Amino acid sequence: SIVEWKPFDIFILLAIFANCVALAIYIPFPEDDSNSTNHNLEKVEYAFLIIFTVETFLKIIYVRNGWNLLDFVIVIVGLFSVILEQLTDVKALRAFRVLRPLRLVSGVPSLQVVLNSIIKAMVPLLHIALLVLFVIIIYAIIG
């Protein structure tokens, strides 16, 4: 934990960016089709998952922070998906790896604070949202 101050956070940020770009370069083919690039990206995702679960296990030795909870949730979801694929809907659970770019904001306090300000700005708009919902319900009933 003494040496993990500067390089560990930078390495995790780089890993998140690499996972994001690997997800970007994936081509979803219709009707279970594939190519060689997807086959390589499967192993790339395997390695990224291994790194992520290693980091999650190491960081404990956690749950109070929401971002750490999100990281734990996505890591165990990836483990669940991998175990199910290996021991087997099958790829329907694959959509939970899109949250990897989301945790990049945690590492970016700037983006984070901006995110916190934007989220906190939504409190006054809840009454307007309720009014919109009521108007929608009334008009739907009339229709």
Binding site: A24, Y26, P101, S110, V114
Partner: protein, 158 residues
């Protein structure tokens, strides 16, 4: 030594020059006559020569160091170097098929030389240039949101 270059006559001359450049650029259209094209190249060469001469005259009467301090002079240097590079590449042993259209957009930006004298709208420009860190932060957050939802849509409806 420097009174003539700062005269109102010089200002009006550079304004008419930039108007001529804008008219030359904004006169291209589909199936344009060949003679119109000939006038366009003639005007491009003549105005490039005139602007280079004006820049050289200014450099010998105002000072080289005072230019790069302000962001206007360096941009003008970039524009004139791009224009002379465009002309030499066009008339050299290189065809440059796609680069002809790109280089026109480089020389199209001469209207900034006359919009810089506003001094009334420059407050907004200064404020938005000083808030660049915040602007980049919000733009990056929006881009990240777009990227996340694009990946989710790729997974769902791919």
């Amino acid at each position: 030594c420097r009174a003539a270059v700062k005269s109102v006559t010089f200002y009006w001359l550079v304004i008419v020059l930039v108007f001529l450049n804008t008219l030359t650029i904004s006169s291209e259209h589909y199936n344009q006559p060949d003679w119109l094209t000939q006038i366009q190249d003639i005007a491009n060469k003549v105005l490039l020569a005139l602007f280079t001469c004006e820049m050289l005259v200014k450099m010998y009467s105002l000072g080289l160091q005072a230019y790069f301090v302000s962001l206007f002079n360096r941009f003008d240097c970039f524009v004139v170097c791009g224009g002379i590079t465009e002309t030499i590449l066009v008339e050299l042993e290189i065809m440059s098929p796609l680069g002809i259209s790109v280089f026109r957009c480089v020389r199209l930006l001469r209207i900034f030389k006359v919009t810089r004298h506003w001094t009334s709208l420059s407050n907004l420009v200064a404020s938005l240039l000083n808030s660049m860190k915040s602007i980049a932060s919000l733009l990056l957050l929006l881009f990240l949101f777009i990227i996340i939802f694009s990946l989710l849509g790729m997974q769902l409806f791919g």
